[PDB]
Amino acid sequence: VAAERLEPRVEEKDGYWILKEQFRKGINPQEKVKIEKEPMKLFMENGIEELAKIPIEEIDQSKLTKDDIDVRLKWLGLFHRRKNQYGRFMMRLKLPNGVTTSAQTRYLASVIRKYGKEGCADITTRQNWQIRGVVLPDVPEILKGLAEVGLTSLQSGMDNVRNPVGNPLAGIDPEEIVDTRPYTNLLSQFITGNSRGNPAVSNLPRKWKPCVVGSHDLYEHPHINDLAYMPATKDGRFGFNLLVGGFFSAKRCDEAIPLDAWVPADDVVPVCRAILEAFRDLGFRGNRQKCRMMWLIDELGVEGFRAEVEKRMPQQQLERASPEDLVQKQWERRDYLGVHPQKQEGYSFIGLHIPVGRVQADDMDELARLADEYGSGEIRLTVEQNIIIPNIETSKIEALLKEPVLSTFSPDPPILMKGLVACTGNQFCGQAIIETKARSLKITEEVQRQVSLTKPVRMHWTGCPNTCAQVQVADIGFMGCLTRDKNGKTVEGADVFLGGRIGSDSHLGEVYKKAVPCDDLVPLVVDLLVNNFGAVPR
Ligand code: SRM
Ligand code: SF4
Ligand SMILES: [Cl-]
Ligand SMILES: [Cl-]
Ligand SMILES: [K+]
Structure with missing residues (x-):
């Protein structure tokens, strides 16, 4: 690989990151959309306020505004259902580690309830919420409401960092390796710039998925993530070995491979930043089916790519992988549905089956009520599109099992x-x-x-x-x-x-x-x- 191949292809300009003029030849149509107008401006410069006032029939009459609603709005987590639910938007959150509250759940329910037959919600395969039925004029108020209850929808679609997945049993499982919540929280805060937007990581060549492992079960599916943190001790210190490049597509599915890198636990964010910067700076931006990060790793070789990550670390240091990690290969994936004791004595969690992840507003309110009455007001989502309600005093379980809603959302389907x-x-x-x-x-x-x-x-x-x-x-x-x-x-x-x-x-x-x-x-x-x-x- 020539030295010229390693020239960063993007530059910072007025707070955003844009393709340098000499690297714009041959780019795909999505790259052209990003050049024509910076998507993050819809949030960070409140472009959404004026856009939301334009009737959709008028929006569709110019390329710039049609691209705003069909493409750029995905940077604010809004997805126009043009073909199948015209004029309505699915909205997708950041929900690191799948953790929600009863207050957040009720708020989301109140939004979808307004839309009647056009509304409902779904748990996603990244342990995340999607809501449906949203109309453009309501977007400014919904953004405000989300912020009020401690939620963000930033950077959840298109060429952005996807929901950080962790262990659904984080902090509560007697058998966990490490609580993943602090790390997934940090990643989400980094990605979204503490819910203000982070333009440094919003102009990637393509979507990019992170997870942090804390379970022997590997509930987090590290093998299919663009970056997976595998807990590992190295030379007496706790940290993570790094796997890179896992992805699925129509064309190609590939498991993540070792970067041959270990970082101390405190370097989770720095190395996420270094990897994203390398991908942003150097990734191909042609045929969309050749833009996922694994394609860059194949072009440079894993060692060539590793060197690019290393040069972007503080003090330009990146240790080699630890020979062993903390994940025990002798393991049987555990069912989390049903009632299970927590590591905190006298407490249990309950896993509830959500048929194909689909809920209505009334269902969400009922689940929120259960979390308040029986738990601590927390609801956790899983990548199998189920729920866990943690922190239930075990003496309450008998009463919980008699709750009518558990006939629909069952602890033992x-x-x-x-x-x-x-x-x-x-x-x-x-x-x-x-x-x-x-x-x-x-x-x-x-x-x-x-x-x-x-x-x-x-x-x-x-x-x-x-x-x-x-x-x-x-x-x-x-x-x-x-x-x-x-x-x-x-x-x-x-x-x-x-x-x-x-x-x-x-x-x-x-x-x-x-x-x-x-x-x-x-x-x-x-x-x-x-x-x-x-x-x-x-
Ligand atoms: C909701 C969800 C499926 C679900 O029912 O749970 C989903 C929904 C869609 N995905 Fe996805 N993806 C979902 C997880 C995935 C995963 C699984 C994962 O992350 O573990 C993959 C495969 C793994 C991967 O990408 O490495 C995935 C691969 C894609 C692809 C193909 C990516 C590629 O490189 O080719 C696209 C289309 C594209 O990017 O070209 C896509 C595009 C879409 C869109 C946004 C297309 C669109 O605008 O209509 C879908 C929105 C449909 C809707 O209204 O809900 N979705 N998508 C998941 C939301 C996750 C989240 O919370 O962020
Ligand atoms: S797999 Fe296809 S049909 Fe299903 S949500 Fe993804 S893009 Fe839509
Ligand atoms: Cl569509
Ligand atoms: Cl998307
Ligand atoms: K399910």
Whole structure:
């Protein structure tokens, strides 16, 4: 690699970071949008106030403003559902470590409630909240309301740092390695500039995902993150070994690889900054499918990339990885649904199943009520789109289990439901090829009616090749497609994936059978479960 390849391609100009004039040739259309107007100005210079007053029909009449609502607003966590819910916006938060409060939950519920049939909310595969139904004129007030309850939606979509994922059992599990909350909190504060915006990390070549590991279970899925912090002692000091480059895409799925770097615990933010600066400064900005950070690592080689991180560390120091980390390979992933004792004597947490992560305003209020009556007003989200309510005095559990809402959001649903994960799908998502959430519930219910089993089989349903529901991690995965019935009629289908493993012995699954009509999946899945997962016909 020539020395010229290492010239930073962006520069700071008036508080924002822009592509240098000599690096603008051949860039993709999204890069052109970012050059035409800095997206962060919508928040940091309050551009949203005037934009929100323009009728959407007028907005659509000029490229600049249409790009504002369809592209730039994703820097404020707002996602125009142009195709499938025209004029409405999904809104996505920062929620480091999946931690929310009852007050925040009620606030989000009050927002979606206003929108009636156009509103609802979802737990995401990054243990995050999305709300739906938002209209542009309400955006300024919603931004204010979020801030009032201690939430931000900054930099949650497009070419930004995604929600920092941590251990859902952080601080409460007798078996945790290290509480991940302080680190995910710090990362979120760094990324968003303490909820004011951080332009230094908002003009990346592409999305970028971080997680901090604190569980032997590896609930955080470090193998699929762009940066994963693996807890490790080195020379008698606590810190993290670093894995880099994990990502999924239609084109390519790759597990994270060692950077061959260890940092002391206090260097979590400095090294996040150094890696992001290297990616920002040096990453390809052509074909969007070749812009994720792993592509830069392949171009420079991992050592070449490492040197770029190192030069951007304070005092330009970056130690090599510790030979061992603290994660025990002898481990069985633990079910967190149901009632479990905390490390604090006399306290329990309860994991509740949220069917395909979907909730209405009334459901959110009820969950918030439970967290107040039984817990400490805290609700935690998980990457399987479930919830945990921690800090419940154990003597209260008997009463809790009798609460009517637990018949819907159950501490002990059937085993296949426990592991079921599904993306948004075509109810709202314009990329989706099929409907996912309703279909996956229906099929899973029919399958479980036919077979019993004891193995915790994890089924993931994703609506298109973007694989937001991570079919490549599933025991059985379903990727949306259109296919044909016996008469040659167009029908919704799924490509079925097998072979995904999580935890320390991770592995990426691959397509096993293409183009199966959705109406034909039940017998296929029943047979797979009996033949490969020890299921028994009822
Ligand atoms: C909500 C969520 C799925 C879910 O039901 O939980 C989702 C939703 C969408 N994703 Fe994603 N992604 C979700 C996690 C993921 C993950 C999984 C993960 O992070 O572990 C991936 C695969 C892992 C990865 O990217 O490395 C993922 C891969 C993408 C991709 C493909 C990325 C690529 O490099 O090609 C896009 C489209 C793109 O960027 O080209 C996409 C684009 C989208 C958009 C924003 C497209 C759009 O504007 O319509 C989806 C919004 C639909 C909607 O209305 O909800 N989404 N997306 C997840 C929100 C996470 C969060 O809170 O931030
Ligand atoms: S996998 Fe496809 S259909 Fe599902 S939310 Fe992501 S982009 Fe939409
Ligand atoms: Cl996005
Ligand atoms: Cl759309
Ligand atoms: K769920």
